[PDB]
Task: inverse folding
DNA sequence: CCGCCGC
RNA sequence: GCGGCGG
C-alpha cells in the first residue's frame, strides 16, 4: 500500500549504487505476495535494509512472525558498491483494485503510495463436460480450475466465493 | 422523451407557443409561492432519494404536468396585465 | 523470446546515417574541425572569400577563419536559457595603395550556434531544428506558354531574392520579349549591347529557325553598338543620368543578383546539360574590357528557336521534376544568412575607408560584429524555418529533423498556389515519402524525405539503385540524380534472383515513371530495396502492403505522437528499423569499444575498455523534454560484463533492449461490445491499469519572475501578506516550495510581493503533482542572460503519473485511432477457454470502411507469438506471407491446445456449440473431429471466446491477438475547463481567464444561428446578456441562484446603452420609442 | 405603464437637446490628480456633471460650449458630402 | 470552421 | 498578429 526509501523524496527519483529507479522498484513491489494469518494483522509494515555488493530479494525482509512471504526470489533491486537501500513497505488486507491516488497512504510525510492489487487469484477457468452417470445423456459436468498467487488457496477462494454468492441470495428477503 | 409532449403540442396552435406558456407558468409556481398548483392530490410529481419532489425540484416539470390536464387556460389576452399579479399575491401565501 | 524474421530480398546495403542531412550539412557548412591549409570551398569560408576581398585605394583580404571555444556546455545552455554558440573570429589583413604597408590583425565577429551529436540546435534555452527546404533550383527552364497554346517561353531563375527574374517570349506582332521585373524590352537590344552583331547573330542562330527575322530586325537601333547600352538604360523606368552609369546594369553583371553558388556544379549543372554548354566564371558575369561577355544569353534564345523548330533535343521541362528541385540543407540555410551578414558588414567597412586617417585605421576601424550577430541570431530565433523540436518521443524529433517544407522565404513557394505541387510527383520515388505528408490544409506541401534519400552536392535528392549487367545483379550501388534516372530502365527488387542472375522472362521495370514489362537483357538498373520508396517513419508499419495509402499516412504520423511509457515494449511484430531508429537517434547509449563494466550506478555507468581507458557515462536521470515527457536512461547492463562494441549500455526513452517501443503489446479481441466501441471507441480492461501497462510520466514547467517596478521591487520571500500559515508549510525554503511536496490546484508554488501585495506563482487550476527540481538565478549571474528589469528568475518543475483513463486516446501503427470509452473489470470481459482474458476489444466496423487489413494481419501473427512466445520482423513489401503465418499459427495450436490435452481435459459443451454455428457458417470443413476443427478455426486466426458476464460463448469464432497499440500525447488534462463564474476583462467585459478562473467557451455567430433557428429565445438572450455584458443582469442572476430563485428579467444590454451614447457622442441622435411613437427610458 | 421597446430612432441633435441630456458642462482639462484619486473638479471626472463616485454614474452626459462653430466630420467627409450636396458648394473641394 | 499551445 | 498540433 505504501513505501518509503530513506534518502528518496519523490516517486520519480534515483538512488545511488542502485540500478533500478524508484518507479521500477515500487512496481516490482506490487508483485510482492505476502500472507498474514489473522485479522489482528490489518496493516503490517515490512522493513528491509541491505548495503554494498548484493542483490535484494524479497527474502531479505526481516521476518514478521505470524505473516509470511511466499514471494521469495522476487528481484527487488541490484546494488553496486556503497549502495545504501533502507526502506519500509506498508502492507494491507483488502479487496479489489485501489489506485494509489484513491487511498493516498501517509505513514511518513515523504513516503510514496503504491497501487493496490488485492485479488489473490490470477485466473479462473471452467469447463462443462458431457457425462458421468445418469438415466439421460444430456447432463453437465462442471469442473473449474482456479489459480492463486499463494496468499490464500484455490479451495479457500472457492469457498469464500460461494459464500459471497449465498450472502447476496438472502438479500431478496424484505420486499418493499 | 418527454411526458406527452405530443399531447402538449396538440394543445397549442404553434410550437413556440407551448414553450412560453410552459415557462411563465413555471415562474408563477415559484414566485407566488409553490402551492399555486392544481393537481397536488394523489398523482403529483416525485423523486427517488425520498418522496420529496412534492415541494420544489424542477418547476417546468410541474407546469407541463399541469398543462397536460384541462386545469389551466392560456390565451393572447385573457386577463388584464397588472390585475393578474395583484390577485395572485392575495390568494396565495 | 526467439526473434524470427521473414526477409527474402537480400537487403544489400545497410541504411545510411539517418540524420546525415543535418549533421554533414553543418560539418561541410563550417569546416571548423580541420585546418585552413586544406580549408573547404563552400559554406563559411566560401561566403567569406565572397564579400571579403574588399575594394573601395583600400584592400582588406581574408586569411583564415578560426573558432572553437564554446563559452559554456550544452546542458548549461538549457538550464540557463543560454544559446549553445561557438566564438568566431578571423585574421584579416589590410593592404595599402602605399604598396609598402599592410595590416594583419584579428577581430571577433559574434557567436554562431553549434550542432549537437543528435543533429539539433540549442538557441535560447530550448532545442530547435532547422528543417530542409525545396524550390526551383536556380537554373534555366523552358515551359509552355500560359493561354496561347502556340509556343513556349524561356525562364532564367537565380536566387537569392535580390537577383533578377528573367523570362524570354516571342510574340505574333513581332520580335522577342525578355521581361525583367514587371517590364519588357527587345531581346536584341541587349545582344547588340554585348557585341552580338546582326550578321554573326542571325547566321549561327537562324541557321535553322526562320524566327531570326525577329532579331536581325534592328535597322535603326542595331547599327549603333555601345550607344545601345545607353539606349537600354533609357529603357529603365526611372529618369537618370545617361552618363554610362552601369549601376542597374552593373547589378545584373557578376556580383550580387545572379549567383555566387560554387563554381562548377551549383548553377552550371543546369547550364551544361539542359542548354548551351560551358560556363565562364559563376554566372552571366563579365564586365571586363569595357565590353561584356554573356555566354548565357544567346543560348537561352538559341534553344528557344531550337524548341520551336525541330527535335534538336526535345526540352520540355517538367518543373516539379526533383531534377530541377533543390533541397536546402541546414548548412546552405545558415551559410546563406551568413553571407548576408558578411555583406552587411562589408557594407559599413567600405564606408569606413573614406571616413578616416589612412594608416590610423586598422582592423577595428573596419570591423563591427554588430551586423553578423543580428544576422545569424535573427535566423535561429526569428526565421519561419527554425522551430520547436517535436520531442513527444525520439522518433518524432527525428522526423521533424528531416522533413521538407515548401513554404518559407516566399520566393520558393507560397500558400494559395499548390494543387500542382501538392501531388506526389513521379520523381518523388525513393526521394520523398508519398505517405509522410500531413492531412488537412498544408497537404503534400510539407513532407519528410525517403529511406536512402540523401542530398547530393547541390540539393537534388538522389536515390540508390543497383546497376545490373546481362542477367547479373551487382552490389555496386549508385546514387542517381532524379534526371539521370530517366535515361535508364530500372527494375524492381521483387524480381526473383539466384544470387546474381535474374529468374523470369517478363520481369517488371519502370522506364520513366511508366510501368513496363521489360526483358532481362534490357534491365540496366535495379532497385536497392522496397524500403527506399518510403520514409523511415512509414517504414515502421508491419504489413504496409495490405494497407490503403490514405490510412497508412494516419499510421505514420501517429507514431510521431507516441508518448514514452514507463514499461516500453517493442512490437510483437516489427518492420526491421526499430533497432536503427533508436540507434541513429541517440535515445540509448552504446559502447564505443569492446571491454568490461565497472560501476552500474542508477545515475552513471562506468566501464573499462580493454584498450586502456575507463570512462564514466552519466545518464540523463529524469529530464524535461520539450513536450513535457520523461527522458531517462535505464542501465541494462550488470556490474562486470564483457560488452561488445556497439552494445546498449542503457535504454533510451521508449527503446527498451535497444528496440524502439512506444506503447505496449496487449491481447485484443476484435468484436463489438454494448456500444462502448460504437463509432471509434475502445474498451479497456481494468487489468491494464493494474500492471501499470499504460502509464506515462509528465512534467509541467511553471515559471515566475521577480519584476522590478518603479513602485518597489517585487521581492521573493515566505511572507504571505494575508496571514496564512497552513499554506506556508510546503513553502519551507524562504520563498521556494520544497522538493518532494504534493502541490494541488490553488497551492503556492512560489511567493512574490509587488506594490499596491501578494503576487505569488500558484498552482494553476488543473493540476500540479510532485515538485521534483527547482532553479533560481540570483544577483551575481554566473554566465546567464537575465533580461532587463528582470531582477531574478525562478523555475519550478512539477510532475505526476499519467495512468490510462477514459478520456485518453490510443491507436495502432496502421491507423486505427480511438478513445477509451469504458474501463471494464477483468471480472466480466471476454475471456479465453483457459482463464486468460483479453486486454482491449476493438470494434470490427472501423476496419472495412477504412482500408487497413494490415492490422488484422499483425493480430494473426501476434496470436502465434503469444503462445509461441516469440517476436517477429516482417519487412515492408517483403515481409511475412499468409502461408507462413498459418504455419506458425499451426505451431501455436500445439501450445494452446496441446498443453490442454495433457493437463487432463478436452472440449467444452460451449466449444462444441460454437463449432456448430461455425460449420453452418462455413469456417470449418464439416465431418472432422472437434480437435481437427478447432485447429482449422485457430489457423483462420479465430478462437472461441466465452462472454465473461454470462460465461456463455459468443456464437462464432472471434479473432484475437497481440496488437501493438500506443497512447498518444492526448491526455484529457488539456481537455476540460469547468467555469461557474469569475474574472472578466477590464477593457471589454469578457470572462477571460488567466490564473484561477478558467475561460468560457466562445459562442460565435455560427452557434447563435444554431440557437436562433431553434427559436431558443431566452437561451440566446441569456448568452448575450445575463452571461456576458449586462453587469447588472449577471449580478441579479448570480444572486437569484444563491437564493434558489428565478433569474431577473433583462435590462437594456450595456451594448444597447453604449450604442445610444456612442451615437449621441456624434450628431446622430438615436432615440428609442414607445407604442405610439414617443420616448422610452433605458435609464 | 412602461412599454416594450418596439421602435428605435436616429435623428439629428438640437443644440437645446444636447443641453437636455446634459448634466453640467465640463469646463476644464484636468485628467488625473495624484494627491487624492478623488477627482479634480469640473474637468472630466467631476461627479455633479456625471454623478457619485461611490456606492447610474456612467449613464449621464456633459456638454462643452464651443466658442465659434465647428462641424461634424461625419457629415462633411462622407463620400457624398451631406452638406456639400445639400448646400451646392463644391461638394468636396 | 473551434480548441489549444507559445516570440 | 507569427508557429505547431487536434476534430
Result:
Amino acid at each position: 500500500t505504501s513505501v518509503y526509501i530513506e534518502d528518496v523524496l519523490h516517486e520519480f527519483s534515483t538512488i545511488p549504487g542502485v540500478k533500478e529507479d524508484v518507479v521500477e522498484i515500487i512496481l516490482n513491489l506490487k508483485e510482492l505476495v505476502v500472507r498474514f494469518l489473522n485479522p489482528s494483522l490489518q496493516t503490517v509494515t515490512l522493513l528491509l535494509k541491505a548495503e554494498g555488493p548484493k542483490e535484494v530479494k524479497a527474502r531479505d525482509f526481516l521476518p514478521v512472525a505470524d505473516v509470511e512471504i511466499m514471494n521469495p526470489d522476487l528481484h527487488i533491486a541490484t546494488l553496486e558498491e556503497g549502495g545504501r537501500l533502507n526502506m519500509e513497505v506498508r502492507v494491507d488486507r483488502g479487496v479489489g483494485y485501489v489506485p494509489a491516488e484513491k487511498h493516498g497512504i501517509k505513514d511518513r510525510i515523504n513516503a510514496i503510495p503504491v497501487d493496490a492489487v488485492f485479488s489473490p487469484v490470477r485466473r479462473v477457468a471452467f469447463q462443462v463436460e458431457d457425462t458421468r452417470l445418469g438415466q439421460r445423456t444430456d447432463l453437465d459436468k462442471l469442473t473449474l480450475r482456479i489459480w492463486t498467487d499463494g496468499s490464500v488457496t484455490p479451495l479457500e477462494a472457492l469457498n469464500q466465493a460461494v459464500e459471497i454468492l449465498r450472502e447476496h441470495l438472502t438479500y431478496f428477503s424484505n420486499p418493499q | 422523451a418527454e411526458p406527452g409532449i405530443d399531447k402538449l403540442f396538440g394543445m397549442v396552435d404553434s410550437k413556440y407557443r407551448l414553450t412560453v406558456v410552459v415557462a411563465k407558468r413555471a415562474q408563477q409556481l415559484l414566485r407566488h409561492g409553490f402551492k399555486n398548483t392544481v393537481l397536488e392530490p394523489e398523482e403529483r410529481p416525485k423523486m427517488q432519494t425520498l418522496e420529496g419532489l412534492f415541494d420544489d425540484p424542477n418547476a417546468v416539470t410541474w407546469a407541463m404536468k399541469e398543462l397536460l390536464t384541462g386545469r389551466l387556460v392560456f390565451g393572447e389576452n385573457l386577463v388584464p396585465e397588472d390585475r393578474l399579479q395583484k390577485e395572485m399575491e392575495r390568494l396565495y401565501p | 523470446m526467439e526473434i524470427k524474421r521473414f526477409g527474402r530480398i537480400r537487403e544489400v546495403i545497410p541504411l545510411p546515417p539517418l540524420t546525415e542531412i543535418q549533421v554533414e550539412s553543418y560539418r561541410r557548412a563550417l569546416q571548423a574541425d580541420v585546418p585552413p591549409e586544406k580549408r573547404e570551398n563552400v559554406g563559411i569560408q566560401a561566403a567569406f572569400r565572397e564579400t571579403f576581398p574588399i575594394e573601395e585605394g583600400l584592400v582588406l583580404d581574408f586569411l583564415e577563419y578560426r573558432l572553437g571555444e564554446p563559452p559554456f556546455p550544452q546542458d548549461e545552455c538549457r538550464e540557463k536559457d543560454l544559446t549553445y554558440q561557438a566564438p568566431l573570429y578571423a585574421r584579416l589583413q589590410l593592404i595599402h595603395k602605399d604598396t609598402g604597408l599592410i595590416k594583419e590583425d584579428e577581430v571577433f565577429l559574434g557567436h554562431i550556434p553549434l550542432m549537437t551529436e543528435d543533429g539539433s540546435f540549442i538557441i535560447n534555452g530550448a532545442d530547435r531544428v532547422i528543417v530542409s527546404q525545396i524550390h526551383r533550383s536556380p537554373g534555366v527552364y523552358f515551359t509552355p506558354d500560359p493561354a496561347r497554346p502556340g509556343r513556349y517561353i524561356a525562364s532564367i531563375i537565380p536566387l537569392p531574392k535580390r537577383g533578377p527574374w528573367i523570362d524570354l517570349e516571342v510574340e505574333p506582332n513581332g520580335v522577342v520579349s525578355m521581361k525583367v521585373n514587371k517590364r519588357k524590352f527587345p531581346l536584341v537590344l541587349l545582344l547588340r549591347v554585348l557585341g552580338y552583331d546582326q550578321e554573326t547573330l542571325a547566321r549561327e542562330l537562324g541557321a535553322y529557325g526562320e524566327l531570326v527575322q525577329g532579331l536581325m530586325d534592328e535597322s535603326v537601333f542595331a547599327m549603333r553598338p555601345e550607344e545601345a547600352l545607353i539606349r537600354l538604360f533609357t529603357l529603365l523606368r526611372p529618369g537618370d543620368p545617361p552618363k554610362r552609369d552601369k549601376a542597374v546594369a552593373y547589378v545584373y553583371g557578376l556580383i550580387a543578383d545572379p549567383r555566387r553558388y560554387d563554381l562548377g556544379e551549383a548553377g552550371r549543372y543546369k547550364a551544361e546539360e539542359k542548354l548551351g554548354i560551358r560556363l565562364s566564371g559563376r554566372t552571366l558575369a563579365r564586365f571586363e574590357d569595357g565590353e561584356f561577355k554573356d555566354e548565357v544569353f544567346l543560348p537561352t534564345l538559341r534553344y528557344l528557336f531550337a524548341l520551336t523548330a525541330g527535335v534538336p533535343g526535345h526540352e520540355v521541362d517538367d518543373i516539379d521534376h526533383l531534377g530541377n528541385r533543390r533541397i536546402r540543407t541546414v548548412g546552405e540555410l545558415m551559410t546563406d544568412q551568413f553571407r548576408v551578414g558578411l555583406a552587411r558588414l562589408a557594407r559599413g567597412v567600405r564606408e569606413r575607408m573614406l571616413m578616416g586617417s589612412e594608416d590610423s585605421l586598422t582592423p577595428a576601424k573596419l570591423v563591427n560584429s554588430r551586423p553578423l550577430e543580428a544576422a545569424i541570431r535573427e535566423f535561429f530565433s526569428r526565421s519561419q524555418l527554425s522551430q520547436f523540436k517535436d520531442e513527444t518521443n525520439p522518433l518524432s524529433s527525428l522526423r521533424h529533423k528531416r522533413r521538407i517544407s515548401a513554404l518559407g522565404p516566399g520566393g520558393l513557394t507560397r500558400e494559395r498556389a499548390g494543387f500542382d505541387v501538392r501531388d506526389v510527383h513521379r520523381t518523388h520515388y525513393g526521394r520523398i515519402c508519398p505517405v509522410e505528408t500531413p492531412e488537412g490544409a498544408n497537404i503534400g506541401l510539407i513532407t519528410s524525405l525517403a529511406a536512402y534519400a540523401r542530398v547530393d552536392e547541390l540539393g537534388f535528392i538522389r536515390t540508390p539503385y543497383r546497376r545490373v549487367v546481362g542477367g547479373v545483379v551487382t552490389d555496386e550501388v549508385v546514387y542517381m540524380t532524379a534526371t539521370e534516372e530517366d535515361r535508364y530502365t530500372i527494375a524492381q527488387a521483387n524480381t526473383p534472383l539466384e544470387g546474381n542472375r535474374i529468374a523470369a522472362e517478363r520481369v517488371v521495370a519502370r522506364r520513366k515513371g511508366e510501368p513496363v514489362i521489360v526483358s532481362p537483357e534490357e534491365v540496366e538498373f535495379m532497385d536497392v530495396s522496397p524500403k527506399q520508396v518510403f520514409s523511415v517513419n512509414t517504414n515502421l508499419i508491419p504489413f504496409l502492403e495490405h494497407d490503403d495509402a490514405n490510412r497508412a499516412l494516419m499510421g505514420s504520423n501517429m507514431q510521431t505522437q507516441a508518448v514514452p511509457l514507463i514499461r516500453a515494449q517493442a512490437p510483437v511484430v516489427m518492420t526491421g528499423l526499430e533497432e536503427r531508429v533508436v540507434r541513429d537517434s541517440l535515445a540509448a547509449l552504446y559502447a564505443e569499444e569492446d571491454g568490461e563494466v565497472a560501476k552500474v550506478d542508477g545515475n552513471r555507468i562506468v566501464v573499462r575498455y580493454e584498450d586502456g581507458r575507463l570512462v564514466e557515462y552519466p545518464l540523463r536521470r529524469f529530464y524535461r523534454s520539450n513536450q513535457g515527457t520523461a527522458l531517462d536512461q535505464r542501465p541494462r547492463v550488470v556490474v562486470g560484463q564483457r560488452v561488445r562494441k556497439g552494445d546498449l549500455l542503457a535504454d533510451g526513452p521508449a527503446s527498451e533492449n535497444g528496440f524502439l517501443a512506444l506503447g505496449q503489446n496487449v491481447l485484443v479481441a476484435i468484436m463489438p461490445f454494448d456500444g462502448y466501441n460504437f463509432e471509434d471507441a475502445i474498451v479497456i480492461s481494468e487489468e491494464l491499469l493494474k500492471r501499470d501497462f499504460y502509464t506515462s510520466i509528465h512534467i509541467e514547467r511553471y515559471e515566475i519572475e521577480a519584476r522590478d517596478t518603479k513602485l518597489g521591487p517585487e521581492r521573493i520571500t515566505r511572507d504571505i501578506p494575508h496571514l496564512s500559515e497552513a499554506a506556508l508549510r510546503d513553502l519551507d525554503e524562504e520563498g521556494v516550495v520544497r522538493i518532494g511536496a504534493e502541490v494541488k490546484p490553488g497551492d503556492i508554488l512560489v511567493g512574490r510581493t509587488s506594490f499596491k501585495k501578494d503576487t505569488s506563482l500558484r498552482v494553476p487550476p488543473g493540476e500540479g503533482g510532485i515538485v521534483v527540481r527547482t532553479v533560481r538565478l540570483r544577483r551575481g549571474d554566473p554566465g546567464v542572460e537575465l533580461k532587463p528589469g528582470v531582477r531574478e528568475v525562478v523555475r519550478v518543475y512539477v510532475a505526476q503519473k499519467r495512468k490510462l483513463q477514459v478520456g485518453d486516446k490510443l491507436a495502432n501503427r496502421h491507423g486505427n485511432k480511438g478513445v477509451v470509452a469504458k474501463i471494464l473489470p477483468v471480472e466480466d470481459m471476454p475471456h479465453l477457454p483457459d482463464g486468460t482474458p483479453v486486454d482491449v476489444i476493438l470494434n470490427p466496423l472501423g476496419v472495412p470502411s477504412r482500408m487497413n487489413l494490415g492490422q488484422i494481419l499483425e493480430t494473426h501473427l501476434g496470436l502465434a507469438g503469444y503462445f509461441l512466445g516469440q517476436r517477429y520482423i516482417s519487412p515492408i513489401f517483403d515481409g511475412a506471407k499468409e502461408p507462413e503465418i498459418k504455419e506458425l499459427l499451426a505451431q501455436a495450436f500445439e501450445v494452446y491446445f496441446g498443453k490442454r490435452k495433457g493437463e487432463g481435459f478436452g472440449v467444452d459443451k460451449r466449444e462444441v456449440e460454437v463449432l456448430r454455428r461455425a460449420e453452418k457458417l462455413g469456417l470449418v470443413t464439416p465431418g472432422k473431429t472437434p480437435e481437427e476443427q478447432l485447429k482449422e478455426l485457430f489457423l483462420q486466426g479465430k478462437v472461441v471466446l466465452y462472454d465473461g458476464r454470462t460465461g456463455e460463448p459468443i456464437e462464432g469464432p472471434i479473432v484475437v491477438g497481440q496488437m501493438f497499440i500506443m497512447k498518444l500525447y492526448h491526455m484529457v488534462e488539456d481537455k476540460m475547463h469547468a467555469r461557474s463564474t469569475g474574472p472578466y476583462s477590464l477593457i471589454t467585459q469578457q470572462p477571460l481567464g488567466g490564473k484561477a478562473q478558467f475561460g468560457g467557451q466562445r459562442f460565435g455567430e455560427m452557434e447563435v444561428w444554431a440557437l436562433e433557428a431553434y427559436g431558443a429565445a431566452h437561451t440566446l438572450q441569456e448568452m448575450l446578456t445575463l452571461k456576458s455584458d449586462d453587469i447588472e443582469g449577471r449580478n441579479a442572476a448570480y444572486e437569484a441562484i444563491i437564493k434558489g430563485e428565478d433569474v431577473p428579467e433583462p435590462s437594456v444590454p450595456e451594448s444597447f446603452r453604449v450604442l445610444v451614447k456612442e451615437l449621441q457622442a456624434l450628431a446622430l441622435d438615436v432615440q428609442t420609442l414607445d407604442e405610439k411613437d414617443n420616448p422610452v427610458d433605458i435609464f | 405603464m412602461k412599454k416594450e421597446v418596439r421602435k428605435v430612432r436616429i435623428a439629428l441633435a438640437s443644440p437645446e437637446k444636447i443641453r437636455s441630456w446634459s448634466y453640467g458642462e465640463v469646463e476644464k482639462p484636468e485628467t488625473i490628480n495624484y494627491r487624492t484619486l478623488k477627482p479634480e473638479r469640473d474637468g472630466l471626472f467631476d461627479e455633479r456633471i456625471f454623478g457619485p463616485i461611490k456606492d447610474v454614474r456612467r449613464y449621464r452626459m456633459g456638454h462643452i460650449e464651443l466658442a465659434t462653430p465647428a462641424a461634424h466630420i461625419w457629415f462633411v467627409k462622407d463620400v457624398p458630402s451631406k452638406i456639400g450636396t445639400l448646400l451646392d458648394l463644391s461638394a468636396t473641394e
